[PDB]
């Protein structure tokens, strides 16, 4: 007889909130838009290296990664990076075009396959 | 705005986080398990994962810190599964371990585990 306790349902948002806080980072993500560095974010190598979707972000702790995105796709970058942590993403008609561009350019094969089927 | 398509691959996360602890690589916390004074067994933690869990409140320390855990000689085999529970957020408890797992949770602020173990003996009050 073995009685199991499971509180693992929270883990999707638990990991998502680690990215939201932007504290204890060991990776710097710069978002260059129209030449100049428009936005900035940070990552946690320990969480990122565990996900095959975040293969583009599999770098040495302390490395600076430069993300070049279209001016149209600037609001969809935060959700895209959070998807590597949370492993959950909500896609609408207006964002399926931009999310497919990001997944193709940054090796998020599962997301790329999902966006392609939504057309 | 009327149609939203959601992708969810978050089911893996219980074991994904559990395997991070299993590997014992890329640690930024040293956990020394002492039994009757002298050091018996050693482990390592990841502050980023541990600080996210309220159960691991005892392990909420600066990256690089050395944490000492003073446990009973009987509760030594339950130490590895107790620390993994902070990562995986899942634990398998038996009749022989429910006594030890309640001692660990009470002494190291794992309130959810302490509450679960206490409710279990109302069921295990009998032999089998």
Author numbering:
A (entry chain A): 129 to 247
B (entry chain B): 127 to 254
Paste lines from the article.
Among primate 90K proteins, rhesus macaque 90K is unique in its inability to diminish the particle infectivity of the tested HIV-1 strain and in its low potency against SIVmac and SIVsmm strains, despite 89-to-97% amino acid identity with active primate 90K proteins. A minimal version of 90K from rhesus macaques, expressing solely domains 2 and 3 [rhe 90K(127–408)] was inactive, whereas its human counterpart showed strong antiviral activity. Interestingly, introduction of V142A, but not L268V, into the short version of rhesus macaque 90K-myc resulted in a gain of antiviral activity that was in the same range as the short human version, and coincided with reduced gp120 incorporation. Since the individual BTB/POZ domains of both the human and rhesus macaque 90K proteins do not feature a similar oligomerization tendency, and given that a single amino acid exchange in the BTB/POZ domain of the short version of rhesus macaque 90K was sufficient to restore antiviral activity, we determined the structures of the individual BTB/POZ domains from the human and rhesus macaque 90K proteins. We expressed modified 90K BTB/POZ domains that contained three additional residues at the N terminus (aa 124 to 250; based on secondary structure predictions and comparisons with available structures of other BTB/POZ domains) in Drosophila melanogaster S2 cells and purified both proteins, which behaved as a single oligomeric species in solution, to homogeneity. We obtained crystals of the human protein that diffracted to 2.1 Å (crystallographic statistics are listed in Table 1) and crystals of the rhesus macaque protein diffracting to 3.3 Å. The human 90K BTB/POZ domain structure was subsequently used as a search model to determine the structure of the rhesus macaque ortholog by the molecular replacement method. The human and rhesus macaque structures contained 1 and 3 homodimers per asymmetric unit, respectively.
